[model samples]
Structures are given as structure tokens and as C-alpha cells.
Target chain A: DEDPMTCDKLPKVPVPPLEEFIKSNPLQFAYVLTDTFDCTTRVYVQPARLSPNQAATALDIRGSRIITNDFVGGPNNSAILNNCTTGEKATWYFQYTNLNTPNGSSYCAYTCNGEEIAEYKCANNNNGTDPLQKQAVEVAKKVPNGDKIHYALDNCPEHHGCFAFY
Target chain B: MTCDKLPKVPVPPLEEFIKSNPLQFAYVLTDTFDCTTRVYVQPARLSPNQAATALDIRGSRIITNDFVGGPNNSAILNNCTTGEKATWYFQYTNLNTPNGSSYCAYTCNGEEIAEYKCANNNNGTDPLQKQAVEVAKKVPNGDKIHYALDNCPEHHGCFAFY
Candidate 1:
């Protein structure tokens, strides 16, 4: 009789790499729609390859009051506002974390009526908890339009535990 | 250590807000044991109705992992996504019993394995989808073994072990 729990006997399921899979999947560019207090929120994705300039452009035409952040592959990444008009009632915030690596920063982006209200950033230390060993890293963005919309990106390096959106 | 002097932000109604306000937080909920995955949404001041709406919109992306198992350890079942309907497969074998008598072997949704004999069996009065195998007595080296299959939520008849 074979023991099912043995490591060698377990099923080998093939899942794709996070970065490569997101680049190919159509949903990567699409928004994950969610409901907040006032209206439906659409969280959009800006792939790693997309430039900060392109991200700004995409937010401008997205119709909703837009706030975005750029990932230029370092600790200096920061969130910025785009296409928000004066006298337009709005509020926004963002949080980012680096996965599978020691370097990560958390920041907040807040704006009201087309004016920057407050911006804040902090380092995300793993303490004793290492998320990288589990291959899980995530970024969350929130924009308060008529309804609040939240966006997030979760990435995994290998197939054992790849990227997923919720 | 409690910060009780913080000012509270006024809650907005179902309308009359702009898109500049950023999301507070978001996450994906996963069941590692069963491989079930779903998105979790948390927004400030949302009513229950709006929360349900958000879940409905994102329902299509939920994914359930496949199950696999078989008899004497042979791969027989595949592609058994959880919560989805599936069929059963069976084969007769006589090796692990006395006199090498016949036994009804069953596999679930193409995965997992169990067996039974004709003389000692009870088929409960329930639809196949809702029935479950409550008990199975193996005969070691004998031809006959008693077993009971019934209706239950945790274990169903078509796939008794889940």
C-alpha cells in the first residue's frame, strides 16, 4: 500500500510563474470591481513593464478620479495622483509591500478636491515572518469615487504558489 | 496605550463621492488544505447589499483544485474541481481477499479509491448526489465484508470521501 501523504507520492500540479503569467493574461490590465460606501470601485492593474509615464496616462483616461504609484524596481517607488480636477470631491490612499525580498516600502496617498492632502511612506520589515519563503507578495490601492474601488496585485515567483487576485 | 482621541471620518451615503479617494485594503482568501481560492474585499462604510454585489461580480474567478486517487495505488481519476459535479468509475478485483473472491472497486471523480462486496451492503434511501458511505468493513482475507452507505452533507454517495 502506498502512503498518499509521502512527498514523492503527492500530485505534481503545474502552475505558471507570476510575472510571466500576468504579462500574458488579459485580466492583468482589467479592473477588479468592488463595492464601497458610495459607488462601484474598479481596481486597475499596471504591469511591471509599464512605465510611470504610461501609468499616468492610463489613469488620466480611466474616467474615474485617478491615483497611481510607480514601481521602478527599487525602494523609491511612490504613489502619485493623475487627472484630478480642482473642486472635484475625492479621497485616496495606497499601500505597497515587496515579496520574496528584504526590501519593501509602505506608503499612503491622500488627496481631496484636486489638492494633495497628505502623503506618507514607511518600510515593511518582515520581523521574524518571512513572506518571501512562502512566495507571497502583494500591493493594494484604494480610490474613493462615488463608490470606493480597491486594486491589488499579488505575485509568486514559481508555479508552486503563483499570483492570484481577490 | 489606546488612542481614543482620534477624530472619526464621516461615513458617506451610497452616492455623492469622487474617485480620488484610495482603497484602504484588499486581499485574497485561500484554503490551503482544499485549494479553494476567492477574493476578499474590504472597503470603508459599505453596506451588506453592496458587499454582496462586489462578491457576485468577482464570482467567476473562484478556482477549486483537482482531486486524484485510486485502487492498490493506480491513478484513475483526474480533473475533480471542488463543488462541481462528477461521475464515478469502477473495476472488479479479487487479490486482497480470501479465496480471491470478487469485490466492487470504486473511484471518486477520477480520484481516490474504496471497495465493497455484494453480500454485506446497504444502499440508503437518498439521491446519489446526497448519499454517503458511512462505514466499510474489510474482510482481511475473507470474501464478505459489511458496509453502510447513507445520505449526509460532508460525504456524498457519488464521491463518498470528498
Candidate 2:
């Protein structure tokens, strides 16, 4: 097997919606929206409490860049981090849409100091809105230290999107 | 901490200008030569994968209402989810007067909204220009969002001169 950190050897995990996440832990939660005009990036970050009385919190990066000057929409995708309580978990999700569009497809990965950690161009054509139209890929081996994460969106001309660090 | 002059990040690339540490990026809510500035909280999640999913989504509608004394404008704001998409919209309106006007300041989540001096206009939405579309959370009880703007239009609540 390839290294887990590589695009081919990531671990599998499940992704839940906001309603499902709230049911498990109820505490002080904060959501922030950030806009990057340079790269034309819009990001959302939400940190929710793991327990009502627990001061230690677990945060999840919500949304990512949707529209830019170049690209429209690509394969609809989602992500989830399994075993968030302890750092020893896996990251898994699905990417659907026309990867072979005109330019190329945008993929999810990790980021550090304004850099990308992983990138994949799988063989799938999820052109519909079924939400389950694509397949899940384990793209991350382990979460980086200091809670580092990265993702990118591609338009018809460019290949890489931008990075969002938590 | 006091100094003759404090050194901060420069605004050439402008991406380096975030109100918070670690740089949480935001957009220019409203820019005026003088008086009544505005800015919204920028969502903190952006990636290519999520972009594909969020491609069609637009920011929430910018709405105006009479809250906190004066007619306050607002809108829905969203953060990005690895799985889901994020969105927010902008609209514009007006806040005017026939008499003397002054500076006003607004902030959200400790972030600057609008800070500028004011002057009256003979016509058009001078006090409030290009009313941004309001943004609202589609999800209920999403997060505790707060805002603090000048309440002079409704009352002489607070004032700041530039």
C-alpha cells in the first residue's frame, strides 16, 4: 500500500451534516466567514464544543471557495474526519462531477503555510446532483500538527485553488 | 502596551490585512469617502473541492430592518464545510439626513464593519450607498452572531470621529 499521506492510501471516514453534528455535542459554538479577494476565495469555519462542560473544543472547517472568475462548479464533494476526539483517526469523503470537464477538476487536500499537501484526479464522472453521485476517497494519512488543513478549487484555466488553514 | 507609533501589516497584497491573528480574511463591506462604513465577517473555509460544491451558491440576501434604534441592514453569512458549500451576498441601501451629520462606527465579532465621517446629500442614498443585500443563516441556531453599529440615525447612542 502507498503511504497513507499520499492521495492513493488515505483512510476512509464518514461525513455528517450540521444537524447531526449538533445532536452529539451542545456547547458554545462560533462560526466565521472569511473572504480572500486576491484568490477570490470565500471560506467558513465553525468550532463546536465536544461536550457541554468541556473547555477543550473540536472545530470543523465548514464551506470552501465556490465561485471564482475562472471556474464554475466541479464535482460536488464533501469531507469528514473520523475519530476527532483523539488525533488518531482517518479522513474520508467523496468527489462527484465531471472531472474531465474542459480544463480539469479541483480536489481536496491538506495545507500548510499557504501550500498544498495532497491532490488527486480520480476516475469518476459525477455530473448529476444526487449528492451520492461520486465515490469516496481516503486522501489524508494523519492530521498535521497545529491543526493544519488545505483545499483547492479549479476553474477552466487554472489547476490549483487556494488553501484554508485552521 | 504603548508606543510612539505601532507597526502593523502593510496593505499592498491586502490579503495580509486581517483584523485577527493568523489572518482571517474578509471583504470590504462598504467604502465611503467619508461617513458610515460597513464590513461583514468573512467565512473562514475555502478550498477547491468545496468550491465545486459551492459553485452555484450565492451569499444570503441583504435585508434592512428597524432594529437597534436605526434601520439596520443585515444578511446571512456562512462558513465552508469540507462536505458542504458556503455562501453570502451583498446589497446596498441608504441612511441620510437634512441636518448636520458626523462619524459612525460599526463592528461584528470584534471586526470592523464601517467607520467614517458623514455629510448630508441633496439627493440619492448619500448616507447609505449601494445597500448590500442581507445575509442570513439558513440553519437555525447556527452560531451566536452579533453586530455593533452607530445608533445615531435612531438615537445619539454612540459616536466616533475620524
Task: Score residue A57 of candidate 2 by CA lDDT.
Answer: 24
How does residue A85 of candidate 2 score in lDDT? 43
lDDT of 2 by residue, B1-162 (tens): 111111121111112111211111112223212122222232236643221111110111111111111122322223222322111212221222352211122223322222111122222233332221112111122122122133212213432221
**Model 2 over residues A1-166: C-alpha lDDT tens digits?**
2223233323323333433333333111111112221223222224434544222223332244332111111222324333344443323333322233343322233212212223222221122222222222222312211111211223312435533321
Interface DockQ of each model: 0.01, 0.01
Q: Total backbone clashes of model 2?
A: 52
Local accuracy by lDDT, each model: 0.22, 0.24
**Candidate 1, TM-score vs. the true structure?**
0.18
Look at candidate 2 and tell me the lDDT of residue B161. Answer: 21
Clashes of 1: 23
Candidate 1 C-alpha lDDT tens digits along A78-110:
223332222122223332233224332122222
